[PDB]
Every structure is written in structure tokens, then in C-alpha cells.
């Protein structure tokens, strides 16, 4: 099904009345005045902006935001170094090397997410079997120096501890969907 836009169905022959109406349109800028009315109208509408520090634009539970590594309620970090979070990262951001901890458990000696390399796809959130690496809600982590953006296990684990309460609520809300 098609539709002609800007196709004049027929040649309306000028009638004085028509001509006057048109000539008035050119002479007294009638349509231009129409446009001014629209903007005056909004001037009276409530502005949609938010006080950025005081009010925040709404983000729902799946917002990917900033990486964090979670821990079991007991206190044992969730990651067991299966290293498929490294395998599926599209940007090669996550670097993981592991060795059996003294307890005998499997754990990662080094877990480094290069956030400048990361493109926040959220697949790592997807891939983890124990769901140790999660996309945390915080988006405000702008840093003065490039090195700060590179994150080792201690920053991510600390990021995990700080935001665990909200991360748990967010995962709680969206897990049925996944």
C-alpha cells in the first residue's frame, strides 16, 4: 500500500478569493505567524529538565552501569574462576589467572576488568554460572586518571560490597525474566 506525499491531485484554477488568500499568505507572512504561535505555546508548558544532582533520570533493574564482583552471604567470593566470562567478553577486557587457594578451593588470583576496553555489553552478567560478575547500577565512576579506570579484583570486590544491597534487589527483580 503506498501513499503520495507532496503530490497535487489536481490543478485548482485560481479564483480571486483563492488568489487573495494566497497573496495575503505571501504579503502578511500568515504561515510564519502560525509558527511563532507554536513556540509561544510551549514557552507556557512546564520544562522537562531534572535537577541533575538532586533528581536522577530513572534507570530500571537491568541497567548495566558499572562492573562489580559479588560474594556469597557467608563471605566467600562467588567467582570460581571458570573463566568463560573472559571467553565471551567481546572486547577482551576481562583478564583472569587462577590457582588453587590454600583452602583448596578454586579462586582467581587476578581478575582485571579494563573498563576503558569494556563496552558494557552485559554478556559477562549473562555468562557467569555462579553469577559472580554483575552489571552494577552505578554509572557515575568518571575518573581523573586513565589508570583508575583499569580495575583489579580488589576494586571490583570492594565495588561489589558497596553496592551489594541494590545489586541483590536488582537481580531479585529480574531473575525470573532470565
Amino acid at each position: 500500500t503506498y501513499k503520495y506525499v507532496n503530490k497535487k491531485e489536481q490543478e485548482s484554477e485560481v479564483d480571486m478569493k483563492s488568489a487573495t488568500d494566497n497573496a495575503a499568505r505571501i504579503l502578511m507572512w500568515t504561515e510564519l505567524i502560525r509558527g511563532l504561535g507554536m513556540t509561544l505555546s510551549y514557552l507556557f508548558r512546564e520544562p522537562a529538565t531534572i535537577n541533575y544532582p538532586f533528581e536522577k533520570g530513572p534507570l530500571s533493574p537491568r541497567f548495566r552501569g558499572e562492573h562489580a564482583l559479588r560474594r556469597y552471604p557467608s563471605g566467600e567470593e562467588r567467582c570460581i574462576a571458570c573463566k568463560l566470562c573472559e571467553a565471551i567478553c567481546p572486547a577482551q577486557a576481562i583478564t583472569i589467572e587462577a590457582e588453587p587457594r590454600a583452602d583448596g578451593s578454586r579462586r582467581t588470583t587476578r581478575y582485571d576488568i579494563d573498563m576503558t576496553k569494556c563496552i558494557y555489553c552485559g554478556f559477562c552478567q549473562e555468562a557467569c554460572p555462579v553469577d559472580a560478575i554483575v552489571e552494577g547500577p552505578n554509572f557515575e565512576f568518571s575518573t581523573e586518571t586513565h589508570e583508575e579506570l583499569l580495575y583489579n579484583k580488589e576494586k571490583l570486590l570492594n565495588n561489589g560490597d558497596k553496592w551489594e544491597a541494590e545489586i541483590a534487589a536488582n537481580i531479585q527483580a529480574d531473575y525470573l525474566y532470565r
Binding site: E76, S105, R106, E154, I171
Partner: protein, 83 residues
């Protein structure tokens, strides 16, 4: 210092990085935090650790607590269970 005894030697220069800055480490260390949790005294030879929370936990696995001497430990949580 860190979880893995990562401590720059007294002569290493990456210590310059920490000059005038905090070397980020976490007081809460897992090796210790799991220890605190007590051994679960289950009464069945084989029990399962779903990870706590089912889908919100870790892949389900069954542990054989048959060895009387030792206690089964979930390769995931580290939680220990004894018969």
C-alpha cells in the same frame, strides 16, 4: 596483604604508585569468611548444595558425605557438610 599475599617488595617501584595514594585492599577475606560458617550436619549420605536461593545461586551439585573422617565441601560455596 591482599587475598593472595600480593605485597610489593620493599624495593619494587610500583610502590611509587601507592605513594600519596591508597593501595586498595579489602579487609573481608574469603579464605577466612567461609571458615566461620559451621559444618552442616546433614543426615543423608548425599546432599545437594544448590547454592542458596536456587536460580539466584550456583549450579546444583550433590556431595558425598560418606567419608566419615572428612566433610564434603561444595566446589562452589565452600560450605561444608558432614553426616
Amino acid at each position: 596483604i591482599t587475598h593472595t599475599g600480593q605485597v610489593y617488595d620493599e624495593k619494587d617501584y610500583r610502590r611509587v604508585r601507592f605513594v600519596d595514594r591508597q593501595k586498595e585492599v579489602n579487609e573481608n577475606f574469603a579464605i577466612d569468611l567461609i571458615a566461620q560458617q559451621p559444618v552442616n550436619e546433614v543426615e543423608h549420605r548425599i546432599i545437594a548444595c544448590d547454592g542458596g536461593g536456587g536460580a539466584l545461586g550456583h549450579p546444583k551439585v550433590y556431595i558425598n558425605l560418606d567419608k566419615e573422617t572428612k566433610t564434603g565441601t561444595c566446589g562452589y560455596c565452600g560450605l561444608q557438610f558432614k553426616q
